[PDB]
Design a protein around this ligand. Structure first.
Ligand code: A1R
Length: 521
């Protein structure tokens, strides 16, 4: 069986995009946003009104310095040792120290550094600031850099130091196995990120295995190091944010939910049928999946290398929607059965390129209308694929079972009637830096979505052959009436037969050919 040749000029195939369900239009009436055992809410829900920056709850700063919550910098327990009159050691408030370090003009880059390091003295002789020093003096002109130091940086310091009156409620850590949600103000997030920018957060820098060894970086220290060329475009994009939220205090709310599923489908038996597909080689997930569930091609440590190294799908999403970065403050690494769902973040910048082609394009005025909880109508899910080192590895059932489960966990929304759930807006998940095969993930995903009762929208990101092969396969499986079960079974029939005992680094027969042949020929 060789697949039927399809319309050679057309840009998309399958169900027309504008027929897929999308929020807010498809959404269930959200209930009274109340705090609960599983939902921390850090603003005044009674006072919550369109256009008005939310008042934080409770009104005055309550601190928790422990292993259940973020260790806020401004805590009275954030200490450093100090010699007294006699030489005997006492503790000094690190917060005060920070305050009086950052309340100074920064008229050169050397100053900002001096500042950050005044509290981070252990890393005086470990933290490179080239990238910054370069950005300020060489990449930004007299005009731009003047606006940065008498305006933006001081504005950032203001919201940074207002933290205790902004994030008055303790932020719990979203640990492994917790099914928990946090919802906080865009304003609150900007304060924390401002703090992140000034490398303010305590106990989050150990090379040595610490308490937070299990969590991603959050201080921005690494954005300052290296002779890397993409650092500046990164800075341009984050300042675009810091400039937008200092000038006009944002009035939205944002929700982070960790999801852990303990019980999965018995895929061999799964009776549910395939869902509707729309696949296109133009568009992008952020660009075109307006209203749908947009996937983040995530690292287990969420956000990937946004604070320093990387600059691919996730890092990019996290830069254009910087409010996602704060997820790193409190989200432990993802186990194989976990994900992070962020409803509410805004897009502040537009871009061009990818990896080392990345340029900051312009500011973006996010268009998304807000929901019942004053959260933008855009829901990202971060799911982490496996980073396959040898290409065949991924067809081992265990590897397929897993990628299936992750995808599932990221899509499934327990309790929710399918007819309310939007489409999933995805693409070549795990088939870039993580080096997996697109044709397989495509299927896997398409199977998981099926199991989740969510229709898919796949962006092939330029690859039009993929658009066809994808589509061809979807339509072949569908007209031949196949459920998730059989389609899974065949994937293992593929392993046993071409992969299990394979001399070469690649099989003689690719997946789709094999599947086509193995069902109806
Ligand atoms: N905006 C957008 N829309 C749709 N498709 C995209 C987009 N950007 C990239 N892609 C496609 O998806 C592929 C995957 O991007 P990538 O970030 O390389 O996804 P992976 O899961 O393979 O990489 C994961 C790791 N990299 C960054 C994260 O920290 C992960 O640790 C990429 O090569 C493209 O073909």
């Amino acid at each position: 069986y060789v697949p039927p040749n399809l319309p050679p000029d057309k840009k998309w195939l399958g169900t027309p995009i504008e027929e897929m369900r999308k929020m807010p239009r498809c959404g269930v009436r959200l209930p009274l946003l109340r705090p609960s055992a599983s939902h921390t809410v850090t603003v005044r829900v009674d006072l919550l009104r369109a256009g008005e920056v939310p008042k934080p709850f409770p009104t005055h700063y309550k601190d928790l310095w422990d292993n259940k919550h973020v260790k806020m910098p401004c805590s009275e327990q954030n200490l450093y040792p100090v010699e007294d009159e006699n030489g005997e050691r006492t503790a000094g408030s690190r917060w005060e120290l920070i305050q009086t370090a950052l309340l100074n003009k920064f008229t050169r880059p050397q100053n900002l550094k001096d500042a950050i390091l005044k509290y981070n003295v252990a890393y005086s002789k470990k933290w490179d600031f080239t990238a910054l020093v370069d950005f300020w003096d060489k990449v930004l002109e007299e005009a731009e850099a003047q606006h940065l130091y008498q305006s933006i940086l001081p504005d950032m310091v203001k919201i940074a130091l207002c933290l205790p009156n902004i994030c008055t409620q303790p932020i719990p850590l979203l640990k492994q196995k917790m099914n928990h949600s946090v919802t906080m103000s865009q304003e609150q997030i900007a304060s924390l990120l401002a703090n992140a920018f000034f490398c303010t957060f305590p106990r989050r820098n150990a090379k040595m295995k610490s308490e937070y060894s299990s969590y991603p970086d959050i201080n921005f220290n690494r954005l300052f190091e290296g002779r890397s060329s993409r650092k500046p475009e990164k800075l341009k994009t984050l300042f675009c944010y810091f400039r937008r939220v200092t000038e006009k205090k944002p009035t939205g709310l944002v929700t982070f939910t960790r999801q852990s599923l303990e019980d999965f489908p018995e895929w061999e038996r799964c009776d549910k049928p395939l869902t509707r597909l729309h696949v296109t080689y133009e568009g992008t997930i952020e660009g075109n999946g307006r209203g749908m569930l947009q996937v983040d091609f995530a690292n287990r440590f969420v956000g990937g290398g946004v604070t320093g190294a990387g600059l691919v799908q996730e890092e990019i999403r996290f830069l254009i929607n910087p409010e996602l970065i704060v997820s790193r403050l409190f989200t432990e690494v993802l186990d194989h059965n976990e994900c992070l769902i962020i409803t509410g973040t805004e897009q502040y910048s537009e871009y061009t390129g990818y990896a080392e082609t990345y340029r900051w394009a312009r500011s973006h005025e996010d268009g998304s209308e807000k929901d019942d909880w004053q959260r933008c109508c855009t829901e990202i899910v971060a799911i982490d694929a496996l980073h396959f080192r040898r290409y065949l590895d991924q067809f081992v059932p265990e590897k397929v079972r897993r990628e299936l489960n992750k995808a599932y966990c990221g899509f499934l929304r327990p309790g929710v009637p399918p007819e309310n759930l939007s489409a999933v807006a995805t693409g070549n998940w795990g088939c870039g830096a993580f080096g997996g095969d697109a044709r397989l993930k495509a299927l896997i995903q398409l199977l998981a979505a099926a199991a989740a009762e969510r229709d898919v929208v796949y962006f092939t990101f330029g690859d039009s052959e993929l658009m066809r092969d994808i589509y061809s396969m979807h339509t072949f499986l569908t007209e031949r009436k196949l459920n998730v079960g059989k389609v899974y079974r065949l994937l293992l029939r593929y392993y046993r037969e071409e992969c299990r005992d394979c001399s070469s680094p690649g099989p003689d027969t690719k997946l789709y050919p094999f599947i086509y042949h193995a069902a109806e020929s």
